[PDB]
Amino acid sequence: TSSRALPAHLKLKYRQESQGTEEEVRKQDLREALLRAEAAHFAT
Amino acid sequence: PTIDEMVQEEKLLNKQRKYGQNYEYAKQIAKDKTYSNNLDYLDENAGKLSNRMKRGDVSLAQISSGGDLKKINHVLDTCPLCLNYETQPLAPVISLSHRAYVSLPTQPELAKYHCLIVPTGHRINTLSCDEDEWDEIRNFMKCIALMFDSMNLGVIFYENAPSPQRYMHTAIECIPVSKRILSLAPAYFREALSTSDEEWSQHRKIIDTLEGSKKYGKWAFRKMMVKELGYFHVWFSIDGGYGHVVEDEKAWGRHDQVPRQVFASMLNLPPEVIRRKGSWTGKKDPREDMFRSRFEKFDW
């Protein structure tokens, strides 16, 4: 139809195991990593 | 069509300087209405922009008069000099040649014995004059010079015709100046002429008839300079001179000044004399009478 509507990036990029998979977020305790990060920023 | 017929069409145009192939090109753009100024469009038309030469006509009646009827006649009807049977000039006049004469200038006045030669016919550029008419101007030049030679003086004369589209008469004016101040003038003008106008011109500032006269003294000016377009010219002695052709006349001076400013400096006068205004009118005896009696001794 046009130039822009040609095949491009036929591949998606699912999340690899280290960079932020959804399963690793469940086992992660977001709660405590949040507080500890605020204390460090505040102290400095 | 036809070649022998087509030759006739070409010579007719040659006399009519106002209309050629530039006016048919410039007319076609105004007439076109839809005209985008590109290279894509100018090619897509191409033939449509050149096409004309149907409405052009008139033949002899157009050329005989020249420079329009309404314009030149309006100039001729008002022209304050032009010597005929019918018309008598506004200038008082001193001595009449067959095709020229001496007369006194406007009231502001540059010097005590300031005069001007004027041809009888409507000449404009003094290069358009006949060689028969020019010979009378030469006898005037020598007698006027010899008049001021007894006074211990000498003279510089000049003429200024930056615009012949206006279609004015040309008055070659005589300016009495002392010989030590005369010898400086070659410098003054040479500065003024090179400075005055913008210096990207083609024609090159300064064209010496003083060196040309050594090659051909009878006519250096007439040979070298060209009549058709603008111009300005000064001279020393009979056939010396400096010469400059004028372009961008708006820059030069519409009322005459570039030369008059140089004489306003060289001779040194107040800043109220610099600009020439007034009129000839008539019957101005007390000033022009003193010149006639003095001039008649040296005047043929």
């Binding site: - | 107040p270 800043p271 109220e272 610099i274």
Partner: protein, 97 residues
């Protein structure tokens, strides 16, 4: 609208842009943006009053007086009605115009 008159005066400072349109528009938008702030610099000078402070002006005036005093300076008069130089002066003025 202000943002842009920033961003395009720094694609002209540099060189990138062309065609009057943009160098015409973002000359307008400045000319306003600047008149806006030559208005405030006036209004907020009559409201905030002279910044010089008399004591400072007194020194500046008096010190100036001593300088002119030291020179034996003559003050420039009003043009006489019989003044040889005025005709010359006028012509110059016009020639400049």
């Amino acid at each position: 609208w202000t943002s842009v008159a920033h961003f395009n005066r720094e694609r002209i400072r540099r060189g990138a842009t062309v065609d009057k349109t943009v160098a015409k528009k973002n000359l307008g938008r400045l000319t306003r943006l600047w008149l806006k702030a030559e208005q405030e610099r006036q209004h907020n000078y009559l409201k905030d009053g002279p910044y010089v402070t008399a004591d400072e002006a007194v020194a500046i005036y008096t010190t100036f007086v001593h300088w002119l005093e030291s020179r034996r300076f003559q003050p420039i008069p009003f043009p006489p009605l019989s003044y040889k130089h005025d005709t010359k002066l006028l012509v110059l003025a016009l020639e400049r115009l």
